[PDB]
Amino acid sequence: AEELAAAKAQIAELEAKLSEMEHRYLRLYADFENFRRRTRQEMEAAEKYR
Amino acid sequence: ELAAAKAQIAELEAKLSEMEHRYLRLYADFENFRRRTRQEMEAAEKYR
Amino acid sequence: MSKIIGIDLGTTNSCVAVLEGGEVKVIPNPEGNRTTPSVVAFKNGERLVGEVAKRQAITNPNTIISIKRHMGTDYKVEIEGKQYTPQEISAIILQYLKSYAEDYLGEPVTRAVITVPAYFNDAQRQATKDAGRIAGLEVERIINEPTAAALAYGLDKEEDQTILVYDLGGGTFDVSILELGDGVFEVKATAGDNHLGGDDFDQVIIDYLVNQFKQEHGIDLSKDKMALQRLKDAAEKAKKELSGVTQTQISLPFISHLEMTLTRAKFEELSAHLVERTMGPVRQALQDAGLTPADIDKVILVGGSTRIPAVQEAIKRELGKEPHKGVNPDEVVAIGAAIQGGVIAGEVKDVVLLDVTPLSLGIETMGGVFTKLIERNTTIPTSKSQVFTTAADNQTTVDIHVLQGERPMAADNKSLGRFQLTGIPPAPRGVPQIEVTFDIDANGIVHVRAKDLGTNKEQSITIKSSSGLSEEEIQRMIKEAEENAEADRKRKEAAELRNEAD
């Protein structure tokens, strides 16, 4: 009865933390993966204008 | 089902370790870029 | 998703900033300007905004100049083809700031946050979230300038405390006294001056200057505006110099020419009068709160013109201690706006530790010549891989020996690993490929692999300590490489390419 409940209880807390886990967890990626492109134009800008 | 609850629980804790790791290697690579780039733009603007 | 982008508007001081990774970032504008400013215009069918709007301002019907004064007011401008309101004009301030943060990042920011005054209340500080969403960029909250840079830095590690800010506007002054609610900010006191600041400073320079030139040649200055521009600029220079530097001069020559040796304590006795137009706002705060100059836990330096030692020699002898200078005060509102911007919609609790590598790691070439793969200082959770080939024709097997240090030599370095690998196929030297991935985890025990290709037979090692020892012992060696300063004489074994026989 109550023996059943902690199942999706724990499950709950877990995937729950997970959501954030995922999100933040590719935040870093996406950003660094952006500014490699950044510095990627930064050589282009220093190619004349430096 | 019964302890398959515990099974996924496992799965997810596991993806906790697994995840954080997936991150700290990230922190590694990210912060690491700097030494390099800084010095790259050094040599860029001494000459030219 | 999307990152929550800062935009402050400080009425002639303004910025839109962001956070990429673990370091706080101050954006660049379309103009070469580190920051382009708050004022704008219009014309037929086409808008003009920023530093590009503002010099078409003394040349064209449309210029709005520091509209900060009308936010939260019933103020309505009569302008061509429709009269206008502070909101619709600011919608364009941040429409342009939107296209500009977009033409920087490429990963759009819809969600955004603002920097307002600490004095403001339900009327105008709503006007912020509202006009914030008028341009189209939503506001996930509105900070206040002072609690903002307070949390650009940030106070929440620390304990229940008290503080007073320093706002220096563009020709406005302010300070707002604050306290910690052990996780909560409520701004307590407010003071400052409606016109005082950097431009005024430049004009005491231009004033004593022009007055002194009428003191010599009898010939007056201010009638002439390329001359006076020359003045504003060169005098700004001498200013920030007096701040940093111990002595100065100004080369303004081919005037029509003034060449002077610019002084510091004359500029100081020049400027040491309005530094007590501040002490007024300051101590008026000290009474608005009730707690004496001796009641505070931390205090700060903000604004553009705050970089000179004038106010700071008025303070070190005012409140007892030095300010936190750990910022680049000029833009210091912008980033602050986004700090929590990414504390909300984004990353949570942060160690950011073992972010460095003990030493340059490499291995045993050509009988001990040491080549690096890993350098020093390198974020630990990483691994680098490289593949050598055959010493000599028919190497039936290859031993592996790895070093840690800098000095390019065998026992001039610390023997780390020694382990070997056999079965290689017999054949000409240099050809066969053997890989070694130095695989460096975060936690400090380092794995290292070497494996043939064509074999796919592989031997690797799992080391233990990597250090086992202390700081001084290492740095005594980091010193030691320097100390040796050319044991590089082993370019002698570099000419041992004599090994080649043909």
Curated annotation (Swiss-Prot), chain B:
Localization per record: Cytoplasm
Domain of life: Bacteria
Segments crossing the lipid bilayer: none
Role, per record: Participates actively in the response to hyperosmotic and heat shock by preventing the aggregation of stress-denatured proteins, in association with DnaK and GrpE. It is the nucleotide exchange factor for DnaK and may function as a thermosensor. Unfolded proteins bind initially to DnaJ; upon interaction with the DnaJ-bound protein, DnaK hydrolyzes its bound ATP, resulting in the formation of a stable complex. GrpE releases ADP from DnaK; ATP binding to DnaK triggers the release of the substrate protein, thus completing the reaction cycle.
Assembly with partners or alone: Homodimer.
Family as reported in the entry's similarity comment: Belongs to the GrpE family.
Official protein name in the record: Protein GrpE
Gene that encodes it: grpE
Shown chain mapped onto the complete sequence: 60 to 107 of 213
From Swiss-Prot, chain C:
Record organism: Geobacillus kaustophilus (strain HTA426)
Gene Ontology MF, one: unfolded protein binding
Modified residues (Phosphothreonine): 172
Protein's UniProt keywords contain Metal-binding: no
Shown chain mapped onto the complete sequence: 1 to 509 of 607
Induction or repression: By stress conditions e.g. heat shock.
Family listed: Belongs to the heat shock protein 70 family.
Role according to the record: Acts as a chaperone.
Entry keyword Nucleotide-binding: yes
Keywords linked to the UniProt accession: ATP-binding, Chaperone, Nucleotide-binding, Phosphoprotein, Stress response
Protein's recorded name: Chaperone protein DnaK
